[PDB]
């Protein structure tokens, strides 16, 4: 399970092994967080140059 061969959970207290399909994380949500990250850096740079106005 640790090596993600079959990915399930072993229930010690019934003496069973439960089996799951591969989970599929939402690609959109992950890629969105990268974009947001970037936007912050962008605004910081801009603002340092805008220090000229004030």
């Amino acid at each position: 399970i640790l090596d993600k061969i079959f990915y399930g959970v072993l229930d010690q207290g019934n003496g069973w092994l439960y089996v799951y399909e591969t989970p599929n994380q939402d690609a959109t949500y992950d890629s969105a967080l990268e974009l947001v990250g970037q936007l912050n850096k962008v605004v910081d740079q801009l603002f340092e140059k805008a220090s000229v106005l004030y």
Partner: protein, 209 residues
């Protein structure tokens, strides 16, 4: 080294593994020091599969064996973490504290922080593979009493890393795992509030000017 001093270990690891191979020392610490540092970060941040590859099967570490107490302790901990041995994990936890963390200048200040991280991590590791355990089994395995285990699990549960609920009436350790689209939804809104905030203020500033 700069990054080892700050909390952030993520950048430290990337730089640190490459430099085991290569760096003629210049006005900075010996290669024995540098070796213990790559082993330490490796535990902390690395995913499981990638600890094995890059570190245990390191050409560098294997040839270098142990000619120092510090390097020995950290190595002993790595072997039980990967092997899912748990009885010996806890003696080993204690050893690295004495012989690694306090001598090293940069990692002294993070002594508390590291041991916290590691103790969450191991408990976590075991819970990932079991839907349930009984309290007796889990406690005997780590080598602590059942009472000592209970007080410690409940430290780390509201900070969210172990993802488990605990029944007292039936003695059982259930392990809930509900991470899915829900997990990721919360990350995006929280960080989002912050981008909005910055933006509003810089907008206002310039308009006046």
């Amino acid at each position: 080294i700069h990054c080892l001093a700050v909390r952030n270990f993520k950048e430290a690891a990337k730089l640190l593994v490459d430099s085991l191979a290569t760096f003629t020392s210049i006005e900075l610490t010996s290669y024995e020091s540098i070796a213990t540092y790559a082993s330490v970060t490796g535990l902390f941040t690395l995913e499981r599969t990638d600890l094995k590859s890059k570190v245990i099967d390191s050409p560098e570490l294997l040839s270098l064996i142990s000619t120092t107490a510090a390097l020995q302790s950290i190595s002993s901990l790595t072997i039980s973490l990967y092997a899912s041995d748990y009885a010996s994990y806890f003696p080993y936890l204690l050893e690295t504290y004495a012989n690694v963390l306090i001598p090293c200048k940069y990692l002294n200040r993070h002594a508390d922080f590291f041991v916290r991280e590691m103790r969450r991590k191991v408990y976590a590791q075991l819970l990932e593979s079991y839907k349930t355990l009984s309290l007796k089994s889990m406690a005997s395995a780590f080598g602590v009493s059942v009472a000592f285990l209970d007080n410690d699990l409940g430290k780390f549960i509201p900070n969210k890393q172990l993802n488990c609920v605990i029944d007292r009436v039936n003695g059982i350790v259930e392990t809930n795992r509900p991470d899915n689209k829900n997990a990721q939804y919360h990350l995006l809104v929280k960080q989002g509030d912050g981008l909005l905030t910055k933006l509003q203020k810089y907008g206002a500033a310039v308009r006046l000017t």
